[PDB]
Amino acid sequence: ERPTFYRQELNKTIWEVPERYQNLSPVGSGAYGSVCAAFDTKTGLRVAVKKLSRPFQSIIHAKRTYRELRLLKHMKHENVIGLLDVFTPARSLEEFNDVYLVTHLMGADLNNIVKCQKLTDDHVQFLIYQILRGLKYIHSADIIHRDLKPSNLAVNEDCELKILDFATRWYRAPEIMLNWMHYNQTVDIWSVGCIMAELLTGRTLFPGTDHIDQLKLILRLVGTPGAELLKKISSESARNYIQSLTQMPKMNFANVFIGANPLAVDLLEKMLVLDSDKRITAAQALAHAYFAQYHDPDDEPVADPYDQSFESRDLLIDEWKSLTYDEVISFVPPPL
Ligand SMILES: CN1CCN(c2cc(-c3ccncc3)c(Cl)nn2)CC1
Ligand SMILES: Fc1ccc(-c2n[nH]cc2-c2ccncc2)cc1
Ligand code: NA
Numbered sequence: 001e002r003p004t005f006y007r008q009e010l011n012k013t014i015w016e017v018p019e020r021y022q023n024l025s026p027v028g029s030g031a032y033g034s035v036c037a038a039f040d041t042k043t044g045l046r047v048a049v050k051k052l053s054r055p056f057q058s059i060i061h062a063k064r065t066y067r068e069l070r071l072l073k074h075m076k077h078e079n080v081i082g083l084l085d086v087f088t089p090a091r092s093l094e095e096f097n098d099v100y101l102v103t104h105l106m107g108a109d110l111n112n113i114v115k116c117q118k119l120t121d122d123h124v125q126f127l128i129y130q131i132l133r134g135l136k137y138i139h140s141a142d143i144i145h146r147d148l149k150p151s152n153l154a155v156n157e158d159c160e161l162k163i164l165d166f167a168t169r170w171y172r173a174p175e176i177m178l179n180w181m182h183y184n185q186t187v188d189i190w191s192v193g194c195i196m197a198e199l200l201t202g203r204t205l206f207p208g209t210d211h212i213d214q215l216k217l218i219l220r221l222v223g224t225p226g227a228e229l230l231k232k233i234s235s236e237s238a239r240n241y242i243q244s245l246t247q248m249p250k251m252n253f254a255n256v257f258i259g260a261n262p263l264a265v266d267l268l269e270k271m272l273v274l275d276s277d278k279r280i281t282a283a284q285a286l287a288h289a290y291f292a293q294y295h296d297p298d299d300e301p302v303a304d305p306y307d308q309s310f311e312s313r314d315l316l317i318d319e320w321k322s323l324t325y326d327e328v329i330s331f332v333p334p335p336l
Helices: 059-074 121-139 186-201 211-222 236-242 262-271 282-286 317-329
Strands: 005-010 013-018 021-029 033-040 046-052 085-087 100-104 153-155 161-163
Touching: 005 021, 013 021, 013 033, 013 046, 021 046, 059 085, 059 100, 059 317, 085 317, 121 153, 121 161, 121 186, 121 282, 186 262, 186 282, 262 282
Parallel strands: none
Antiparallel strands: 005 013, 021 033, 033 046, 046 100, 085 100, 153 161
């Protein structure tokens, strides 16, 4: 049942992966973990192998490890990164302390291609359509990405895009900047608008230096909140700030994004609305005339129900670790 593992040291960390994965070369490391590119001999595809860093060192870490595994196992969509394999070199639960995730290898992210080439309107259409297509799938399972940004959008040479990890502040919705605890899925739509504006102009839309400067840059373009939006702010300390600034009017998006496709400008206006209740959804954005060449209602599927009840649970270290263990053995690979 269990395959054969081989041990090797890459960078300053260790890797114990099955024999089917060969030629492990590092791609990029961080606080999340170490990612290696490998060749899968069972399928012939190039894969990305991610070793989690300290998966069960604290309650926050153990729950986070369980959350990522449950999330990656549920995502089955062409525009969302999915799990090709999940393994551990441990034979029992007692020695279980390392988790490895395997997925399709993507050569670059949207950050590596935005400044390398100012994208044409046709390429922006295809890239943003793929984001919204994957966002409709994610949002249909009551999941919010919360951290959409160019580095979180993997693209290959074929212009095919996938969402990952479902300055960062440059793409954050203003309701999160104001610490509103009841934001909805439309915070991701705000990030898409910031990303789509960057691809069209080649510039970061809101390159704020801090949480304060970020809001001033946003309010400079979309204007200060009106009376309808002000009625929805319960935090008196929040209103003590917004109602105290110099009131900014909403700028003409056709003038700010001059020379761009008028259909692209119209979509940005519906995406970059201050009031989150009036922001366009992912499903509505797919039907926008900007994506007429790509929109297909019968090929924009939704996700199966996702059980998020674990998020409101207070468990111990071994309990989160044992639940993560169960998800490893119960994994079923996707069909070839
Ligand atoms: C902001 N993010 C940048 C990329 N992140 C990534 C990228 C990958 C990946 C997937 C497929 N092909 C290559 C690499 C993985 Cl597996 N994990 N995190 C790490 C954090
Ligand atoms: F300046 C702003 C910027 C954003 C908002 C906002 N948009 N949608 C929801 C909110 C919001 C922000 C803070 N508290 C409640 C609601 C309100 C005022
Ligand atoms: Na992965």
